[PDB]
Amino acid sequence: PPPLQAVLVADSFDRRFFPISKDQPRVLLPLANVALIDYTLEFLTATGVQETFVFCCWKAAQIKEHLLKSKWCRPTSLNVVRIITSELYRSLGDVLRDVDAKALVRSDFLLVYGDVISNINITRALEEHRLRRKLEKNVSVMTMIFKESSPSHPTRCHEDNVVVAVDSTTNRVLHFQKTQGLRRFAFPLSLFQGSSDGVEVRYDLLDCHISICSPQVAQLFTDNFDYQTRDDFVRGLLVNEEILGNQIHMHVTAKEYGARVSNLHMYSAVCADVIRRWVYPLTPEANFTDSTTQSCTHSRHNIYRGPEVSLGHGSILEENVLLGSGTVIGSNCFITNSVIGPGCHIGDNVVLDQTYLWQGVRVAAGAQIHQSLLCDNAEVKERVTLKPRSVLTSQVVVGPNITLPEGSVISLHPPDAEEDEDDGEFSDIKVFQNEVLGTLQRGKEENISCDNLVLEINSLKYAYNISLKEVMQVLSHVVLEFPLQQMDSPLDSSRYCALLLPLLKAWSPVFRNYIKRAADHLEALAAIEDFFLEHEALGISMAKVLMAFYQLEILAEETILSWFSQRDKGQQLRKNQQLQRFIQWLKEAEE
Amino acid sequence: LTTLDVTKLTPLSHEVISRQATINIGTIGHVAHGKSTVVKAISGVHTVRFKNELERNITIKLGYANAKIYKLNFKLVRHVSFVDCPGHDILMATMLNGAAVMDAALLLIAGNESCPQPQTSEHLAAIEIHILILQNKIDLVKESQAKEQYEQILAFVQGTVAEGAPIIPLKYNIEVVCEYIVKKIPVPPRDFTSEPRLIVIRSFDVNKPGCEVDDLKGGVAGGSILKGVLKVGQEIEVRPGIVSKDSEGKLMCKPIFSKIVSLFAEHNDLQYAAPGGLIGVGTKIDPTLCRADRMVGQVLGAVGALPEIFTELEISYFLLRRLLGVRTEGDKKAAKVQKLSKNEVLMVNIGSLSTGGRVSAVKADLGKIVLTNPVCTEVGEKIALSRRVEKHWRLIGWGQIRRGVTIKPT
């Protein structure tokens, strides 16, 4: 048994945190005055990880600087951390391809994002995965970690809901899909044809985004380089079940907790859970990231008080309140279900409900704050009311006499936020012919090569399995229609003649390739004769058009003469002096 | 036994000195893993079994099948190799990127039905370009066989514009077809005098677990020689080499030079090597540097072939409107090649070397695609472009290499 290793991606390849992510990496956001990277690293250290690799691409300098001062980077830590930086990273697939290129992993590593809050001991799941690998001889490649949860729980936001279908006897995953905006779900018949014993469909699973992987995962990722996310990988592996089966399994845990921070709603849910000791022993007063500033004491109704809080007179702290070090609280305040960062200053007669104030937030008196996040050094002036879901970016100051709406998101950066920040608040064959016509029209506009058009014509004809003589008539009809389609409704001999000039110039090699045999030349005249009747506006104009066949050697003069010799309306139309004049002009020129 | 030697100046394609593998022939058809029986009955069941590991890309790797056609206690007239892989799109992309791909085309078409699969196979064969069709519907009614032959003759007359002039009809018919192919097999022009050039399609290391202290044979890569003739003991060079991005900046791609210790075919190949086969060169390369299929996607050269390492390349975008030779009955936009959208990952297949890349930018004339891994193929080679519709990569179009950003690490 080799020592366990874990990969820790420190970048979410998705812009779900504008404008917060524009000046601070998501992984470094303070959940409870502690960075998410600290939480996930502590979780990894607890479960016995001895080697951790962190990949950072966006704002990697700040993550480097913060991490190098952390406890895990100390020489005494049992979790050996290696930091990798590469601006070429664009998705998790690139990260795994790089891992396989450098071959850091030996076997059975852990895949997990950098914003995962968990206290799960995966020893049982790891042992099950290793036993399944040993018995099945390297078939299973992945083991997801899922937690039972009711669908009505706030953690199960509509963005990350997932429905799964597995075999209940061996925990063998059979189907997996998202459920965003879907009122009904679909399941292929295949799931039942293989496992006739039984199939269980589950919707009470919460995606912990934690996976016990294998080097085969990296091998597949570097094989199918189009893969970008873990969901794409699992879908691609499941759809191609017949070849390289490599079935994925899962393990369900119910006595532990785990969830990733995807968006602001999930961030608030995870913060509320963490404050309520749901992630024990990852409680605020434990000070797992040992620091002087983050020390605090626990009291009744989950009230966490830092050093030198200096509480005001008559202020009431109801429940689920975390107070940072060096904070100042005014008189007759009321803060409930909220987290206040260190060094904050609070006015008088304020009401804070389910808000989150980071380091340096200063609030004047009379402000009512509900269900809003205030980034670092944000300031609020007198008598400002914030509706729920409001967001204040770093160093943003809001002036007095304003009631921000529900969707209020403001920042110093103009275009990212919904408002700028400043000291103020205000300011049958027919289908084949149609495909041929579409391809010809597309080729005409795109200036396509003659060879490209010839290949497309051969490809379309071969697929339809149409006869060349029928195709030649179809091509001639389409070509006649194409010159006819050039104008809208001129019904003039000059319009058809002028349009057919450029049309028959470049496409002559295509026409030459289409009709080569003598019988095709006779058929081309027959199609041209039928074209004159179907184009009675240009039917008289066909006398000059018929010369283009001899001009480009498409239809032979003898074949045209034989067509005129053989006789009806068509014979009467061909008997006109206009058709005869073209015949006489060409015959005299010929000899 | 073999009568090989180490004396040759101007190799001959039909020379009996080698009698191992002269011309690489392809077997394209809609057999759907049904051509395996015909191939086995033609040459053998498992004549090639010398090195196997965990399969990496079974559905995206071409497999050769050598076949020595002997006739007259007899004499071997020719010894060619049959190539047939699942998915005609990859084979077509490999063929339409230069030359030396499926020199002789054998079509093991079914004589039972004329479904769209035979039409797609015929379209792929036409796009790739000499072809030879065959009727595999044995054990049927004689009148039904004649009707199927007439239908196949009609299809051949339809396809005669591009390639429709084949003739064919428990292995007696197979032996007759093999004799006819040997009679009609044209000799292809292969350059035996140019500098050595090979593409590695499968890297191996036959050192089993618990090897000896010094008995460590490693570095036996496998592939096909593109141009020139390879001799044992020559100093081969890996064009891709070891590429490391640990420099906290531009990636460094250092090539690897090693003396070619041995060259082995399915049989014991001579010191000299002939193009057109899946031969393996074992050199003085560390087994760690070339793990199981690790060194895939590499070019082996002798004196540092002109192919230079590239990071991003500009191609002349040119795609097909619909699906080439494929049109679904529903046609619900499935058989519609969409435009080359930005940030789309697709492979370019130059020869047998397939690399990945995303279209960073393109405006109607040339896409600047940054390749997944650094590659060294050519400077003006016709590079194909294929995209996966649904679990099956298929050709989307063609283009020409114009310029790019190159790197040369030492």
Short mmCIF file of N, CA and C in Angstrom, two decimals, chain A residues 351-415:
data_model
loop_
_atom_site.label_atom_id
_atom_site.label_comp_id
_atom_site.label_asym_id
_atom_site.label_seq_id
_atom_site.Cartn_x
_atom_site.Cartn_y
_atom_site.Cartn_z
N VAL A 351 -29.15 47.12 12.98
CA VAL A 351 -29.81 45.81 13.00
C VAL A 351 -29.18 44.98 11.89
N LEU A 352 -28.38 43.98 12.27
CA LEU A 352 -27.71 43.09 11.34
C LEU A 352 -28.36 41.71 11.42
N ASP A 353 -28.85 41.22 10.29
CA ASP A 353 -29.54 39.94 10.23
C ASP A 353 -29.00 39.14 9.06
N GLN A 354 -28.34 38.02 9.36
CA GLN A 354 -27.83 37.09 8.35
C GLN A 354 -26.87 37.76 7.38
N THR A 355 -26.17 38.79 7.83
CA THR A 355 -25.19 39.46 6.99
C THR A 355 -23.80 38.88 7.25
N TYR A 356 -22.83 39.32 6.45
CA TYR A 356 -21.45 38.85 6.58
C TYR A 356 -20.53 40.04 6.34
N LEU A 357 -19.86 40.50 7.39
CA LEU A 357 -18.93 41.62 7.31
C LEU A 357 -17.51 41.08 7.41
N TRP A 358 -16.70 41.35 6.39
CA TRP A 358 -15.32 40.90 6.36
C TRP A 358 -14.44 41.91 7.10
N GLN A 359 -13.12 41.72 7.01
CA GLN A 359 -12.19 42.56 7.75
C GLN A 359 -12.25 44.00 7.26
N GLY A 360 -12.25 44.93 8.21
CA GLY A 360 -12.22 46.34 7.91
C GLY A 360 -13.55 46.98 7.59
N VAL A 361 -14.66 46.25 7.71
CA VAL A 361 -15.97 46.82 7.43
C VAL A 361 -16.35 47.78 8.55
N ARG A 362 -16.71 49.00 8.18
CA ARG A 362 -17.14 50.02 9.12
C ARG A 362 -18.56 50.45 8.77
N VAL A 363 -19.45 50.43 9.76
CA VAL A 363 -20.86 50.73 9.57
C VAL A 363 -21.24 51.87 10.50
N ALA A 364 -21.91 52.88 9.95
CA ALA A 364 -22.37 54.02 10.73
C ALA A 364 -23.63 53.62 11.51
N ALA A 365 -24.23 54.60 12.19
CA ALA A 365 -25.40 54.33 13.02
C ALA A 365 -26.68 54.35 12.18
N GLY A 366 -27.67 53.60 12.65
CA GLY A 366 -28.98 53.58 12.03
C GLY A 366 -29.12 52.68 10.82
N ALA A 367 -28.06 51.98 10.41
CA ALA A 367 -28.14 51.14 9.23
C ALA A 367 -28.84 49.82 9.54
N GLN A 368 -29.70 49.40 8.62
CA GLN A 368 -30.36 48.10 8.69
C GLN A 368 -29.79 47.22 7.58
N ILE A 369 -29.15 46.12 7.96
CA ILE A 369 -28.49 45.22 7.02
C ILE A 369 -29.10 43.84 7.17
N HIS A 370 -29.57 43.27 6.06
CA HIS A 370 -30.20 41.96 6.07
C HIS A 370 -29.73 41.16 4.87
N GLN A 371 -29.24 39.94 5.12
CA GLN A 371 -28.93 38.96 4.08
C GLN A 371 -28.04 39.54 2.99
N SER A 372 -26.98 40.23 3.41
CA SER A 372 -26.07 40.87 2.47
C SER A 372 -24.63 40.58 2.86
N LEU A 373 -23.74 40.64 1.87
CA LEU A 373 -22.32 40.44 2.07
C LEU A 373 -21.58 41.75 1.82
N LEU A 374 -20.65 42.07 2.71
CA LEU A 374 -19.84 43.28 2.61
C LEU A 374 -18.37 42.87 2.55
N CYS A 375 -17.71 43.18 1.44
CA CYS A 375 -16.32 42.79 1.27
C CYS A 375 -15.41 43.66 2.14
N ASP A 376 -14.11 43.43 2.00
CA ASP A 376 -13.13 44.07 2.86
C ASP A 376 -13.17 45.59 2.74
N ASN A 377 -13.11 46.27 3.89
CA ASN A 377 -13.00 47.72 4.00
C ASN A 377 -14.21 48.46 3.46
N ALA A 378 -15.30 47.76 3.16
CA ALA A 378 -16.52 48.43 2.74
C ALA A 378 -17.10 49.25 3.89
N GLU A 379 -17.67 50.41 3.55
CA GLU A 379 -18.19 51.33 4.54
C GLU A 379 -19.61 51.73 4.18
N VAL A 380 -20.42 51.95 5.21
CA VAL A 380 -21.82 52.33 5.07
C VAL A 380 -22.06 53.59 5.88
N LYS A 381 -22.68 54.59 5.26
CA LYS A 381 -22.94 55.87 5.91
C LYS A 381 -24.22 55.79 6.73
N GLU A 382 -24.70 56.96 7.18
CA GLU A 382 -25.85 57.03 8.07
C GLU A 382 -27.13 56.61 7.35
N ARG A 383 -28.03 55.99 8.12
CA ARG A 383 -29.39 55.62 7.71
C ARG A 383 -29.44 55.05 6.29
N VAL A 384 -28.76 53.92 6.12
CA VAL A 384 -28.75 53.18 4.87
C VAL A 384 -29.41 51.83 5.11
N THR A 385 -30.38 51.49 4.27
CA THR A 385 -31.11 50.23 4.38
C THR A 385 -30.75 49.33 3.20
N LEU A 386 -30.31 48.12 3.51
CA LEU A 386 -29.91 47.15 2.50
C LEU A 386 -30.93 46.02 2.44
N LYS A 387 -31.52 45.81 1.27
CA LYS A 387 -32.43 44.70 1.07
C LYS A 387 -31.65 43.39 1.01
N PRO A 388 -32.33 42.25 1.23
CA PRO A 388 -31.64 40.96 1.14
C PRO A 388 -30.95 40.73 -0.19
N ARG A 389 -29.91 39.89 -0.19
CA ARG A 389 -29.10 39.52 -1.34
C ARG A 389 -28.26 40.68 -1.88
N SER A 390 -28.10 41.75 -1.11
CA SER A 390 -27.22 42.84 -1.52
C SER A 390 -25.76 42.42 -1.39
N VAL A 391 -24.91 43.03 -2.21
CA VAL A 391 -23.48 42.73 -2.22
C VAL A 391 -22.71 44.04 -2.30
N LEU A 392 -21.71 44.19 -1.43
CA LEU A 392 -20.80 45.33 -1.45
C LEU A 392 -19.38 44.82 -1.67
N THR A 393 -18.70 45.38 -2.66
CA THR A 393 -17.37 44.95 -3.04
C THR A 393 -16.34 45.66 -2.16
N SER A 394 -15.07 45.28 -2.30
CA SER A 394 -14.01 45.79 -1.44
C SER A 394 -13.88 47.31 -1.56
N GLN A 395 -13.69 47.96 -0.41
CA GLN A 395 -13.47 49.39 -0.28
C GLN A 395 -14.61 50.23 -0.84
N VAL A 396 -15.78 49.64 -1.05
CA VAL A 396 -16.93 50.38 -1.55
C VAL A 396 -17.59 51.12 -0.40
N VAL A 397 -17.84 52.42 -0.60
CA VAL A 397 -18.49 53.27 0.39
C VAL A 397 -19.85 53.67 -0.15
N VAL A 398 -20.88 53.56 0.68
CA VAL A 398 -22.25 53.89 0.31
C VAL A 398 -22.69 55.09 1.13
N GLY A 399 -23.15 56.14 0.45
CA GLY A 399 -23.56 57.35 1.12
C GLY A 399 -24.91 57.22 1.78
N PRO A 400 -25.31 58.26 2.50
CA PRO A 400 -26.57 58.23 3.24
C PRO A 400 -27.77 58.45 2.32
N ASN A 401 -28.95 58.26 2.91
CA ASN A 401 -30.24 58.51 2.25
C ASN A 401 -30.38 57.67 0.98
N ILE A 402 -30.39 56.35 1.19
CA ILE A 402 -30.54 55.40 0.09
C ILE A 402 -31.10 54.11 0.65
N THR A 403 -31.93 53.44 -0.15
CA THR A 403 -32.46 52.11 0.17
C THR A 403 -32.19 51.22 -1.04
N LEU A 404 -31.09 50.48 -0.99
CA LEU A 404 -30.66 49.69 -2.13
C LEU A 404 -31.66 48.57 -2.40
N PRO A 405 -31.95 48.27 -3.67
CA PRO A 405 -32.89 47.18 -3.99
C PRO A 405 -32.36 45.80 -3.64
N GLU A 406 -33.16 44.77 -3.91
CA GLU A 406 -32.80 43.41 -3.55
C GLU A 406 -31.56 42.94 -4.31
N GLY A 407 -31.49 43.23 -5.61
CA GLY A 407 -30.41 42.72 -6.43
C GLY A 407 -29.18 43.60 -6.46
N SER A 408 -29.05 44.49 -5.47
CA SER A 408 -27.96 45.45 -5.43
C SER A 408 -26.60 44.78 -5.39
N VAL A 409 -25.82 44.94 -6.46
CA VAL A 409 -24.44 44.49 -6.53
C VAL A 409 -23.63 45.63 -7.13
N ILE A 410 -22.81 46.28 -6.31
CA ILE A 410 -22.04 47.44 -6.73
C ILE A 410 -20.56 47.20 -6.46
N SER A 411 -19.72 47.85 -7.26
CA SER A 411 -18.28 47.68 -7.16
C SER A 411 -17.60 48.91 -7.74
N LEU A 412 -16.30 49.04 -7.44
CA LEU A 412 -15.50 50.09 -8.06
C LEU A 412 -15.41 49.90 -9.56
N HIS A 413 -15.33 48.66 -10.01
CA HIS A 413 -15.25 48.37 -11.44
C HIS A 413 -16.61 48.61 -12.09
N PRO A 414 -16.71 49.49 -13.09
CA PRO A 414 -18.02 49.88 -13.62
C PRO A 414 -18.79 48.72 -14.25
N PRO A 415 -18.22 48.01 -15.25
CA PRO A 415 -19.09 47.13 -16.05
C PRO A 415 -19.45 45.81 -15.37
#
